[PDB]
């Protein structure tokens, strides 16, 4: 033949993308959002299945030559039981029937919707969970607290809010002593609008005979009390020991208002 002028290529100098290793990347990949491309480095064909198993909520895409690849989130598969009963975990790892917050090899990532509480997608789980002895004071108050002003008033989230209010109306009419309904009434009072006031009064006014005498003596005085109250020009609530004692979450709106009307001297 003839003597070809041979040239060797300049030394390969990798980049961060080329040096990436998906095995080290669970903390990078779990917080990724919808439509966000998480680049993960070269991936061998015999690993693609492993990586798709580990991250079933993500699509595995081939971005460039030599197996260069990325994960694109497609969905959130977290379950109400694992997402709704906590405001702090955003995902969990499932292995061998067990659920763990921390990553272990062999585990499958499941991810909670980032706005799950803000959407009302937890309302059917927590309406149940919060009732009974499964009640977690901190979680269930937070759940009820946060239902007000949902999705910054997006229409889906505003309906969520309404529907839940009706469901809680029907429940707490039956027995407002049950700690979810006490918190519900407590939080209606904080909202302090026409609709929350008439929801409180509607609920309190449907309580049973025994409830009213155990809890609402301030709102339903004995005739002996009422006719004593006429003598003084102060409203009854300002002196009546039944109202200084009483539990404010069970006062009617009128009575709760009136308690504010009692002039104290500064000091």
């Amino acid at each position, epitope marked *: 033949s003839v003597e070809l002028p041979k040239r060797d290529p300049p030394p390969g100098v990798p980049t961060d993308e080329m040096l990436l290793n998906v095995d080290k990347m669970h903390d990078v990949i779990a917080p990724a959002k919808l439509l966000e491309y998480v680049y993960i480095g070269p991936l061998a064909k015999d690993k693609e299945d492993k990586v798709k198993k580990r991250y079933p909520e993500f699509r595995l895409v081939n971005t460039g030559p030599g197996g260069l690849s990325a994960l694109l989130r497609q969905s959130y598969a977290g379950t109400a039981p694992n997402c709704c009963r906590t405001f702090q975990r955003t995902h969990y790892w499932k292995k061998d029937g067990k659920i763990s917050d921390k990553y272990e090899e062999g585990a499958v990532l499941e991810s909670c919707w980032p706005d799950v509480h803000d959407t009302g997608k937890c309302d059917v789980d927590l309406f149940d969970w919060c009732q009974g002895d499964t009640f977690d004071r901190n979680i269930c108050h937070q759940w009820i607290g946060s239902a007000f002003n949902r999705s910054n008033r997006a229409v889906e989230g505003q309906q969520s809010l309404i529907n839940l209010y009706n469901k809680m109306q029907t429940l707490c009419s039956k027995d407002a002593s049950v700690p979810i309904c006490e918190s519900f009434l407590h939080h209606l009072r904080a909202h302090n609008t026409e609709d929350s006031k008439e929801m409180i009064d509607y609920i309190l*006014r449907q309580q049973s005979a025994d409830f*009213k005498q155990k809890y609402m003596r301030c*709102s*339903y*005085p004995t*005739r002996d009390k*009422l*006719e004593e*109250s*006429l*003598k003084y*020009a*102060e*409203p*009854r*609530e300002c002196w009546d020991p039944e109202c200084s004692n009483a539990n404010v979450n069970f006062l009617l709106t*009128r009575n709760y208002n*009136n308690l504010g*009307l009692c002039n104290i001297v500064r000091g």
Partner: nanobody, 118 residues
């Protein structure tokens, strides 16, 4: 002379409504507790609703939610709204005025009849 004539009663089947009025003269609401009273024959009178000189209200338990008392300052007239009336609301209704911190300056007005029957 202090006048507390009540007016507005009558006949209604149960569930209807009635609005009593008391056009007080000789007394001012700015320093009087005004109250609506009942008296069914055979029984002693009873408070039904009351309003302080500042405007705080209060009710007898059996009428709470159904009745609501209000007042018009410029008209010096107190009202009783009676909704969802029960056969046991049958009584003569009248108004009562009490001077804020005097006790002896108490007055009673003329009754009005409301009866509720099928």
């Amino acid at each position: 002379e202090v006048q507390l004539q009540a007016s507005g009663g009558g006949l209604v089947q149960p569930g209807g409504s009635l609005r009593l009025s008391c056009a007080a003269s000789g007394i001012v609401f700015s320093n009087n507790r005004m109250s609506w009273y009942r008296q069914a024959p055979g029984k002693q009178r009873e408070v039904v609703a009351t309003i302080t000189s500042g405007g705080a209200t209060d009710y007898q338990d059996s009428v709470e939610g159904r009745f609501t008392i209000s007042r018009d300052m410029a008209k010096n007239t107190v009202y009783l709204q009676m909704n969802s009336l029960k056969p046991e609301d049958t009584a003569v209704y009248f108004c009562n005025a009490r001077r804020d911190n005097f006790a002896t300056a108490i007055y009673w007005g003329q009754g009005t009849q409301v009866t509720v029957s099928s």
